Amino acid sequence: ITDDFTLTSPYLGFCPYCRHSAPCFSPIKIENVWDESDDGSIRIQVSAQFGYNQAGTADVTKFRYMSYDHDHDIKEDSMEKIAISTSGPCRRLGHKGYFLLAQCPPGDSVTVSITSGASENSCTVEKKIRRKFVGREEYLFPPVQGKLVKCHVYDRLKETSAGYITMHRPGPHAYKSYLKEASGEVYIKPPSGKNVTYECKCGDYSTGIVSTQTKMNGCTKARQCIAYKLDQTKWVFNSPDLIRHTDHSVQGKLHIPFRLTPTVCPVPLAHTPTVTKWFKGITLHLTATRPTLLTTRKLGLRADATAEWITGTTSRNFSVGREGLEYVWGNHEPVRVWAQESAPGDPHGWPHEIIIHYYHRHPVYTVIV
C-alpha cells in the first residue's frame, strides 16, 4: 500500500448535471456513494482531493481544485466553501483524499457543490437514500433510554482502512487551444516553456517534440491534427472518463478511509401489553405509536408463525393449546404461555355436568364414546 500523496492529482469528469442542469465537465465529479450504515452516514467519493495542500503537505483545511483553463495546473481553495446536500443542507463528519463522510436527511439525490468563489459547480447523482432503523420498533430519533443492540456505523476517524483502490499513469490530454488556423497551412504552439508532443497524420504519420511555434511539412486542415503535454506523470484514479495509457498497470495502492465498525446503539422498547386469559386462548391489548412487530409461534410439531407490523391500539385473539405458545413484542424478551385443561362444568356430581366438562376438552373423543 502507499500513503504518500504528493505524486497524484485530481481530474475532470463528465458530471451528469451542473449548475445550469446540463451534461457538464466539472472538477467535482463523483463516482460512487455508499449508504450501508445503520446511522444514516454516507461515504462520498469525489474527483477533487480533500484535506491536502497543493504539493500534498497534508493541510487540514485545503483541497485541490484542478482549474478549468488551459495550461492546466492544480490550485486550492478554502475548505469552508465545500458543502454537500441531499434535500436540505447536511453536516460533514470527515474528509480525506477523494472521500468525504456525510450524514444527510432522506431524499432522492446526492449533491456536492462549492458555495462561493470564482467558479461554482455542483454534481447530482440519482440514489435513493431512505431512513433506516435498527432491529424492530421503527423509530425516528434514538431514545434516551432503551435496550442496547449491535449496530454498524462508519468510523469518522480518518486513519481507518476499509478497502483497496488503485491508480494508473495519466493518459494523453489533448487541447484545441494548441492549434492555429490562419491560412492554408497548420500552425501549432506550445505554452511558455512547455514542450508538447504534437503528432498527426495527413499524408503520413509523424510526431515530434517542439518548444515554440513550429511549421508543418504541409497539410490543409488543422482539425485533423492534435497536440498534448508530456510533462505530466501524476497518477489518476481508474475512472471511466479518461483516456487509457499505453500500459495501464497498477502503480500505487491507497486506502478508502472510514471502515465500517461494529458498535452498540439504543433502541426503543414498546409498551408492555395487558393480557386477558380465556380458556385455551389469549388476548393481547397491544399499543404502539409507531410500526412495531409482533411474532408468535407454537411449541408443538407445527409452528405456523405469524408476523404483522401493528401500528394502532388493537386487540389480537391468539389460540394457545396444551403444547404452548411463545410471542415477542417489539424489542422485549420472548415470553412463553402454556394453557391447561379448565373447562366449565364438573367431572363429578351429575352426568349433565360431566358431559359438559368433557365436551369442551377433546370435542370428538366424547362424541364417539
Binding site: 442496547l148 449491535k150 458498535t263 452498540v264
Partner: protein
C-alpha cells in the same frame, strides 16, 4: 459470573457499557475507563489545559493566576494579566 463481551473490562473487572469509555468521565472504580493507557490521547480537553509540557497535567482553565499553585511545578501563577 463471566463478564459480557459487549461490555468493557476494567482492571477491577467491573463490566460497563462500551459507550461510557473515552468520554472524559470516570465511570469505573479504579479510573481505567479514562486512563491514557486504555484510550489514546494527545491534545487535552476543551476545559482543561496541559501544565508543564513534561507531566502533561490537565487542570480546569478557571485555575489560573488565582494565588494558589495547582501543579507539581511552579508555572501556575505567572503570565496572567492584572
Amino acid at each position: 459470573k463471566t463478564c459480557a463481551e459487549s461490555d468493557f473490562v476494567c482492571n477491577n473487572g467491573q463490566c460497563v457499557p462500551s459507550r461510557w469509555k473515552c468520554d472524559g468521565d470516570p465511570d469505573c472504580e479504579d479510573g481505567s475507563d479514562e486512563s491514557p493507557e486504555q484510550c489514546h490521547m494527545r491534545t487535552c480537553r476543551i476545559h482543561e489545559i496541559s501544565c508543564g509540557a513534561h507531566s502533561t497535567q490537565c487542570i480546569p482553565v478557571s485555575w489560573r493566576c488565582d494565588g494558589e499553585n495547582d501543579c507539581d511545578s511552579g508555572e501556575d501563577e505567572e503570565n496572567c494579566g492584572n
